Scaffold this motif. Structure first.
Motif, PDB file in Angstrom:
ATOM      1  N   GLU A 148       0.790  -1.228   0.000  1.00  0.00           N
ATOM      2  CA  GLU A 148       0.000   0.000   0.000  1.00  0.00           C
ATOM      3  C   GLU A 148       0.826   1.285   0.000  1.00  0.00           C
ATOM      4  O   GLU A 148       0.268   2.381  -0.026  1.00  0.00           O
ATOM      5  CB  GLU A 148      -0.966   0.006   1.187  1.00  0.00           C
ATOM      6  N   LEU A 149       2.148   1.156   0.031  1.00  0.00           N
ATOM      7  CA  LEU A 149       3.007   2.331   0.031  1.00  0.00           C
ATOM      8  C   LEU A 149       3.547   2.600  -1.368  1.00  0.00           C
ATOM      9  O   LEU A 149       3.879   1.671  -2.109  1.00  0.00           O
ATOM     10  CB  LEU A 149       4.164   2.140   1.010  1.00  0.00           C
ATOM     11  N   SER A 150       3.629   3.878  -1.727  1.00  0.00           N
ATOM     12  CA  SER A 150       4.235   4.258  -2.992  1.00  0.00           C
ATOM     13  C   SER A 150       5.756   4.267  -2.866  1.00  0.00           C
ATOM     14  O   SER A 150       6.317   4.076  -1.784  1.00  0.00           O
ATOM     15  CB  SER A 150       3.732   5.629  -3.438  1.00  0.00           C
ATOM     16  N   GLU A 151       6.427   4.484  -3.998  1.00  0.00           N
ATOM     17  CA  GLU A 151       7.885   4.475  -4.005  1.00  0.00           C
ATOM     18  C   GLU A 151       8.453   5.601  -3.152  1.00  0.00           C
ATOM     19  O   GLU A 151       9.429   5.406  -2.417  1.00  0.00           O
ATOM     20  CB  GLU A 151       8.403   4.571  -5.439  1.00  0.00           C
ATOM     21  N   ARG A 152       7.857   6.792  -3.240  1.00  0.00           N
ATOM     22  CA  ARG A 152       8.296   7.900  -2.398  1.00  0.00           C
ATOM     23  C   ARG A 152       8.071   7.592  -0.924  1.00  0.00           C
ATOM     24  O   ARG A 152       8.940   7.860  -0.086  1.00  0.00           O
ATOM     25  CB  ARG A 152       7.569   9.182  -2.800  1.00  0.00           C
ATOM     26  N   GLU A 153       6.913   7.021  -0.591  1.00  0.00           N
ATOM     27  CA  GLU A 153       6.652   6.636   0.791  1.00  0.00           C
ATOM     28  C   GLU A 153       7.598   5.538   1.254  1.00  0.00           C
ATOM     29  O   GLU A 153       8.020   5.539   2.413  1.00  0.00           O
ATOM     30  CB  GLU A 153       5.200   6.194   0.952  1.00  0.00           C
ATOM     31  N   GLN A 154       7.941   4.597   0.373  1.00  0.00           N
ATOM     32  CA  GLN A 154       8.898   3.557   0.738  1.00  0.00           C
ATOM     33  C   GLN A 154      10.272   4.151   1.025  1.00  0.00           C
ATOM     34  O   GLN A 154      10.943   3.756   1.987  1.00  0.00           O
ATOM     35  CB  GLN A 154       8.980   2.512  -0.373  1.00  0.00           C
ATOM     36  N   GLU A 155      10.712   5.098   0.194  1.00  0.00           N
ATOM     37  CA  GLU A 155      11.994   5.751   0.440  1.00  0.00           C
ATOM     38  C   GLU A 155      11.972   6.529   1.747  1.00  0.00           C
ATOM     39  O   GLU A 155      12.945   6.503   2.514  1.00  0.00           O
ATOM     40  CB  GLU A 155      12.348   6.672  -0.725  1.00  0.00           C
ATOM     41  N   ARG A 156      10.871   7.231   2.019  1.00  0.00           N
ATOM     42  CA  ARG A 156      10.751   7.954   3.279  1.00  0.00           C
ATOM     43  C   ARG A 156      10.786   6.999   4.462  1.00  0.00           C
ATOM     44  O   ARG A 156      11.402   7.298   5.489  1.00  0.00           O
ATOM     45  CB  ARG A 156       9.465   8.776   3.294  1.00  0.00           C
ATOM     46  N   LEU A 157      10.131   5.842   4.337  1.00  0.00           N
ATOM     47  CA  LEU A 157      10.157   4.849   5.405  1.00  0.00           C
ATOM     48  C   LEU A 157      11.567   4.333   5.650  1.00  0.00           C
ATOM     49  O   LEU A 157      11.994   4.206   6.802  1.00  0.00           O
ATOM     50  CB  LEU A 157       9.215   3.695   5.068  1.00  0.00           C
ATOM     51  N   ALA A 158      12.307   4.033   4.582  1.00  0.00           N
ATOM     52  CA  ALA A 158      13.675   3.550   4.742  1.00  0.00           C
ATOM     53  C   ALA A 158      14.556   4.595   5.418  1.00  0.00           C
ATOM     54  O   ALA A 158      15.305   4.292   6.359  1.00  0.00           O
ATOM     55  CB  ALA A 158      14.252   3.160   3.383  1.00  0.00           C
ATOM     56  N   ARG A 159      14.468   5.843   4.954  1.00  0.00           N
ATOM     57  CA  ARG A 159      15.296   6.898   5.524  1.00  0.00           C
ATOM     58  C   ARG A 159      14.926   7.172   6.976  1.00  0.00           C
ATOM     59  O   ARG A 159      15.805   7.391   7.817  1.00  0.00           O
ATOM     60  CB  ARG A 159      15.177   8.163   4.679  1.00  0.00           C
ATOM     61  N   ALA A 160      13.631   7.156   7.296  1.00  0.00           N
ATOM     62  CA  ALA A 160      13.206   7.374   8.673  1.00  0.00           C
ATOM     63  C   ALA A 160      13.633   6.232   9.582  1.00  0.00           C
ATOM     64  O   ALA A 160      14.005   6.470  10.735  1.00  0.00           O
ATOM     65  CB  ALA A 160      11.693   7.566   8.728  1.00  0.00           C
ATOM     66  N   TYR A 161      13.593   4.993   9.089  1.00  0.00           N
ATOM     67  CA  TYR A 161      14.081   3.869   9.877  1.00  0.00           C
ATOM     68  C   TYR A 161      15.565   4.020  10.176  1.00  0.00           C
ATOM     69  O   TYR A 161      16.015   3.756  11.298  1.00  0.00           O
ATOM     70  CB  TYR A 161      13.813   2.558   9.142  1.00  0.00           C
ATOM     71  N   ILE A 162      16.346   4.437   9.176  1.00  0.00           N
ATOM     72  CA  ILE A 162      17.770   4.656   9.416  1.00  0.00           C
ATOM     73  C   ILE A 162      17.976   5.771  10.434  1.00  0.00           C
ATOM     74  O   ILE A 162      18.798   5.651  11.348  1.00  0.00           O
ATOM     75  CB  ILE A 162      18.502   4.949   8.096  1.00  0.00           C
ATOM     76  N   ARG A 163      17.238   6.872  10.295  1.00  0.00           N
ATOM     77  CA  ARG A 163      17.358   7.964  11.254  1.00  0.00           C
ATOM     78  C   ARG A 163      16.973   7.536  12.663  1.00  0.00           C
ATOM     79  O   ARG A 163      17.525   8.065  13.632  1.00  0.00           O
ATOM     80  CB  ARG A 163      16.496   9.147  10.817  1.00  0.00           C
ATOM     81  N   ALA A 164      16.037   6.599  12.796  1.00  0.00           N
ATOM     82  CA  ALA A 164      15.618   6.109  14.102  1.00  0.00           C
ATOM     83  C   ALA A 164      16.622   5.147  14.729  1.00  0.00           C
ATOM     84  O   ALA A 164      16.845   5.199  15.943  1.00  0.00           O
ATOM     85  CB  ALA A 164      14.253   5.429  13.991  1.00  0.00           C
ATOM     86  N   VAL A 165      17.233   4.265  13.937  1.00  0.00           N
ATOM     87  CA  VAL A 165      18.108   3.232  14.488  1.00  0.00           C
ATOM     88  C   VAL A 165      19.587   3.523  14.240  1.00  0.00           C
ATOM     89  O   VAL A 165      20.420   2.632  14.420  1.00  0.00           O
ATOM     90  CB  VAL A 165      17.737   1.839  13.954  1.00  0.00           C
ATOM     91  N   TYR A 166      19.933   4.749  13.841  1.00  0.00           N
ATOM     92  CA  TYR A 166      21.329   5.076  13.559  1.00  0.00           C
ATOM     93  C   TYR A 166      22.243   4.797  14.746  1.00  0.00           C
ATOM     94  O   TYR A 166      23.407   4.423  14.567  1.00  0.00           O
ATOM     95  CB  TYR A 166      21.441   6.543  13.141  1.00  0.00           C
ATOM     96  N   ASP A 167      21.740   4.974  15.966  1.00  0.00           N
ATOM     97  CA  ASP A 167      22.612   4.933  17.133  1.00  0.00           C
ATOM     98  C   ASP A 167      23.041   3.521  17.509  1.00  0.00           C
ATOM     99  O   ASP A 167      23.912   3.366  18.370  1.00  0.00           O
ATOM    100  CB  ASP A 167      21.923   5.601  18.319  1.00  0.00           C
ATOM    101  N   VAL A 168      22.463   2.491  16.890  1.00  0.00           N
ATOM    102  CA  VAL A 168      22.770   1.112  17.233  1.00  0.00           C
ATOM    103  C   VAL A 168      23.317   0.330  16.047  1.00  0.00           C
ATOM    104  O   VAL A 168      23.546  -0.874  16.158  1.00  0.00           O
ATOM    105  CB  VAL A 168      21.542   0.398  17.833  1.00  0.00           C
ATOM    106  N   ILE A 169      23.538   0.987  14.910  1.00  0.00           N
ATOM    107  CA  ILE A 169      24.027   0.325  13.711  1.00  0.00           C
ATOM    108  C   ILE A 169      25.321   0.998  13.267  1.00  0.00           C
ATOM    109  O   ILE A 169      25.681   2.079  13.729  1.00  0.00           O
ATOM    110  CB  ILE A 169      22.990   0.328  12.572  1.00  0.00           C
ATOM    111  N   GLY A 170      26.024   0.330  12.359  1.00  0.00           N
ATOM    112  CA  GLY A 170      27.269   0.832  11.834  1.00  0.00           C
ATOM    113  C   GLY A 170      28.048  -0.249  11.116  1.00  0.00           C
ATOM    114  O   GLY A 170      27.700  -1.431  11.166  1.00  0.00           O
TER     115      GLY A 170
END
Ligand SMILES: NC(=O)c1ccc[n+]([C@@H]2O[C@H](COP(=O)([O-])OP(=O)(O)OC[C@H]3O[C@@H](n4cnc5c(N)ncnc54)[C@H](OP(=O)(O)O)[C@@H]3O)[C@@H](O)[C@H]2O)c1
Ligand SMILES: N[C@@H](CCC(=O)O)C(=O)O
Length: 416
Positions: A111-133
């Protein structure tokens, strides 16, 4: 039944066959870090919707944790934790300097468009940045995620990271243009083929001209059949999919079957072949059987009807423990599910090494290194199988848990 309880019970059953301290078992029964975050994106209609994202790091005694990200509407913290626990043993059995990790977002990506999918990916990275690397946690593609999302995620991580290090290595499964690795499309099938070759070597069976049957004709199944036919010189006689299946004793051509599937939408009514169903397909007298489809296909109902000398569990746990015991009683050699399809995580490790080093390999080099890793892992598991007189799945669990336990003892985490 809950998935994390299933994983913990599996771990306890594995610990039954090996000498491991109680404190180490208690340590291994808990993920070392669980992160649950809110993932807000602004939709196409302008409204802001918040999704639930997870990032479980089960254990990192052996090195940085590894594991994919699922985008499934039925995602739960229990599922992510169980899959991270499974990934720990998966990377331990094939001897990678990795821990176990797993992420996920409770979202319906259809149900998500390509722009929404990209926003979801970027927001997930922004949320979990502190525990990944690159040296902490390396995500990867998984169910309903693809290299496109991986590239978006890597770009967001590099933007946050200000290019202060190997941002390419923070995530695997990327497109070839940006830190991608060759042999990423046939990793699982190539690893399965190497394990099947080693199993035939152990059993003394020459695969030149023998028979193979494959259940499930997706990426894994189709590439398994194709690589088997070319490298092992075998006779592909049966290849079913989601709809139906076909049979031809003289041999099928996987390329033509894939073309037919692309044209008619399925592998049904293939010319020169007899249409059959999955259940009888599982019971043809074939040298090896490669279930590469929906899990739990071989149960107590049909376990005694299997005529295959080798069963390569390319899929994720397609055999139940009762069927495991029944098959072992018949002398049928089984390749455990998290050892047979360990080629994908091995090639992801190779991609991470290439990204970290800044130097990229060719197809031949990746294939040879995958051959070495898979052959060594299979022989380790088989030697444990013979020495301990236990099941192959139990031997693989013993090897993985022993490696993780040794790493934990070396760090001083557990004193006993
Ligand atoms: O990528 P991909 O999705 O094409 O590969 P995939 O997700 O790994 O799917 C494996 C293949 O087997 C099919 N399949 C699904 N359930 C099956 C079952 N119970 N028995 C036998 N085959 C089954 C899949 O069809 P579908 O993915 O179309 O369901 C697909 O063709
Ligand atoms: N094995 C999982 C994730 C592991 C990985 O590729 O890193 C998969 O099928 O993608």
């Amino acid at each position: 039944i809950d998935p994390f309880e299933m994983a913990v019970k599996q771990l306890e059953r594995a610990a039954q066959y090996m000498d491991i301290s109680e404190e180490a078992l208690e340590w291994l029964k808990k993920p070392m870090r669980i992160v649950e975050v809110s993932v807000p994106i602004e939709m196409d209609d302008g409204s802001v919707k918040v999704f639930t994202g997870f990032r479980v790091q089960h254990n990192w005694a052996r090195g940085p944790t590894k594991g994919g990200i699922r985008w499934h509407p039925a995602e739960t913290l229990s599922t992510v934790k169980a899959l991270a626990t499974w990934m720990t043993w998966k990377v331990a059995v094939v001897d990678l300097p990795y821990g176990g990790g797993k992420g996920g977002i409770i979202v319906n990506p259809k149900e998500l468009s390509e722009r929404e999918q990209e926003r979801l990916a970027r927001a997930y990275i922004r949320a979990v940045y502190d525990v990944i690397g690159p040296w902490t946690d390396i995500p990867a593609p998984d169910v309903y995620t693809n290299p496109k999302i991986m590239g978006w995620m890597m770009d967001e991580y590099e933007t946050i990271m200000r290019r202060k290090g190997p941002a390419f290595g923070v995530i695997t499964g990327k497109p070839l243009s940006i830190g991608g690795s060759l042999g990423r499309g046939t990793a699982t099938a190539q690893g399965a083929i190497f394990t099947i070759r080693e199993a035939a070597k152990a059993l003394g069976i020459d695969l030149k001209g023998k028979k193979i049957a494959v259940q499930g004709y997706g990426n894994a199944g189709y590439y398994t059949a194709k690589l088997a036919k070319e490298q092992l010189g075998m006779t592909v006689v049966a290849v079913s999919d989601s709809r139906g299946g076909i049979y031809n004793p003289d041999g099928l051509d996987p390329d033509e079957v894939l073309k037919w599937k692309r044209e008619h939408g399925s592998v049904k009514d293939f010319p020169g072949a007899t249409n059959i169903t999955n259940e009888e397909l599982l019971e043809l007298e074939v040298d090896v059987l490669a279930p590469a489809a929906i899990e739990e296909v071989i149960t107590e109902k049909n376990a005694d009807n299997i005529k295959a000398k080798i069963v390569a569990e390319v899929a994720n746990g397609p055999v139940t423990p009762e069927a495991d015991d029944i098959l072992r009683e018949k002398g049928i050699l089984q390749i455990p599910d998290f050892l047979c399809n360990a080629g994908g995580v091995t090639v992801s490790y190779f991609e991470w090494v290439q990204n970290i080093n800044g130097y990229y390999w060719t197809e031949e080099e990746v294939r040879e290194k995958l051959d070495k890793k898979m052959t060594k892992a299979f022989w380790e598991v088989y030697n444990t199988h013979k020495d301990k007189n236990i099941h192959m799945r139990d031997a693989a669990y013993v090897v993985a848990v022993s490696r993780v336990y040794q790493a934990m003892k070396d760090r001083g985490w557990v004193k006993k």
